[PDB]
Amino acid sequence: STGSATTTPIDSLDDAYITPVQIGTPAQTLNLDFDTGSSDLWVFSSETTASEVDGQTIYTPSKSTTAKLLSGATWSISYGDGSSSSGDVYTDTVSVGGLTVTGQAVESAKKVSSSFTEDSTIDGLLGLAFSTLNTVSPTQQKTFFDNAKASLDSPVFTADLGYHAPGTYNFGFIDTTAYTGSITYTAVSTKQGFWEWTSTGYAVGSGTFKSTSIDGIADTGTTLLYLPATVVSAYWAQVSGAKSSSSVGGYVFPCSATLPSFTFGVGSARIVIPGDYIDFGPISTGSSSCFGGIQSSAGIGINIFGDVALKAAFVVFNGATTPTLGFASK
Numbered sequence: 001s002t003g004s005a006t007t008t009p010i011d012s013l014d015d016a017y018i019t020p021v022q023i024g025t026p027a028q029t030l031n032l033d034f035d036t037g038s039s040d041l042w043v044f045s046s047e048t049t050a051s052e053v054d055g056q057t058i059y060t061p062s063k064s065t066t067a068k069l070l071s072g073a074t075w076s077i078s079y080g081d082g083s084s085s086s087g088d089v090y091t092d093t094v095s096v097g098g099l100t101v102t103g104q105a106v107e108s109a110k111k112v113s114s115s116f117t118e119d120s121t122i123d124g125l126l127g128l129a130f131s132t133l134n135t136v137s138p139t140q141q142k143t144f145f146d147n148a149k150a151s152l153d154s155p156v157f158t159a160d161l162g163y164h165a166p167g168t169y170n171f172g173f174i175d176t177t178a179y180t181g182s183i184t185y186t187a188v189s190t191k192q193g194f195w196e197w198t199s200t201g202y203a204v205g206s207g208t209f210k211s212t213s214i215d216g217i218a219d220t221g222t223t224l225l226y227l228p229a230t231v232v233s234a235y236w237a238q239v240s241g242a243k244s245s246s247s248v249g250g251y252v253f254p255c256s257a258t259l260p261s262f263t264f265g266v267g268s269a270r271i272v273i274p275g276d277y278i279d280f281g282p283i284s285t286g287s288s289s290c291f292g293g294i295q296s297s298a299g300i301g302i303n304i305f306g307d308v309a310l311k312a313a314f315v316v317f318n319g320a321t322t323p324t325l326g327f328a329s330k
């Protein structure tokens with residue numbers, strides 16, 4: 001089997017991407033944030049505290065003939081940005097892009113934090129990290145990809161995120177029309193539950209490539225590129241007037257600037273992030289200070305290749321016996 005679904009930016013900045021997901025029978029279509037940095041499939045639901053719902057589409061298990069309570073199971077998750085959600089669990093049929101999993105754990109939110117409520121465009125998350133990170137207790141649950149994987153033609157999914165445009169998530173096959181050149185594969189550590197890999201270095205603009213190991217995660221659920229402070233300082237030093245602002249919470253730059261590209265290594269290959277991808281626009285409406293798309297990881301504890309980096313590539317999440325990660329230019 002395979003599946004193929006279009007993923008669409010939620011706003012003009014590509015802050016996140018939503019992908020339609022069919023849950024239940026008859027189908028209830030929710031727009032979920034596919035997150036390779038977490039492992040819970042959770043949704044706004046008929047159980048979500050009413051004051052915490054503002055415009056989201058909700059899953060109503062009582063209207064699904066295939067929904068069953070996963071008796072006694074609860075979940076609770078905290079993300080890197082400080083957001084959180086929790087609730088109880090149903091099993092139901094879940095389809096993505098024509099690929100169906102029966103008996104998928106669908107984590108129904110009873111509570112969500114303010115950042116979720118305030119985003120009407122995201123109806124929940126679909127985690128694609130390793131199932132070892134799933135928060136369901138007392139019986140940990142599998143991701144959609146791990147429930148799908150044996151059924152797939154190949155044990156892979158691919159992320160093809162657009163810059164200010166829709167893109168694609170494919171399951172079970174690699175679309176050889178979707179990238180240019182060849183795919184470079186690189187090893188993955190599952191030790192922390194993530195698609196954790198080591199980049200071979202970086203360049204700023206037209207500068208020389210610096211060979212250096214940077215261990216980080218491929219995380220579709222993080223907007224920005226978070227790298228060591230040395231690397232980030234080297235990048236922003238090439239932008240007149242850029243500075244780190246503790247009041248704003250990271251590097252800002254004059255909106256009049258033209259940003260340099262950023263290159264990261266994948267083995268002997270190179271992925272180039274155009275400068276425009278690193279522009280996240282005014283810090284507040286009408287401001288002439290703009291927020292940078294490359295930020296320091298020094299206050300995280302991990303480097304994160306988020307959407308800024310991933311959208312510059314065709315990315316293969318190879319879930320073979322020994323998982324790996326492929327990158328191609330596009």
Ligand SMILES: CCNC(=O)CSc1nnc(C(C)C)o1
Nearest residue numbers: 130131132146149190319321323
């Ligand atoms: C195909 C998705 N599998 C899982 O989520 C299982 S947890 C897990 N931790 N390491 C692995 C192997 C891929 C090495 O798997």
Ligand code: NA
Nearest residue numbers: 249280283291
């Ligand atoms: Na922000």
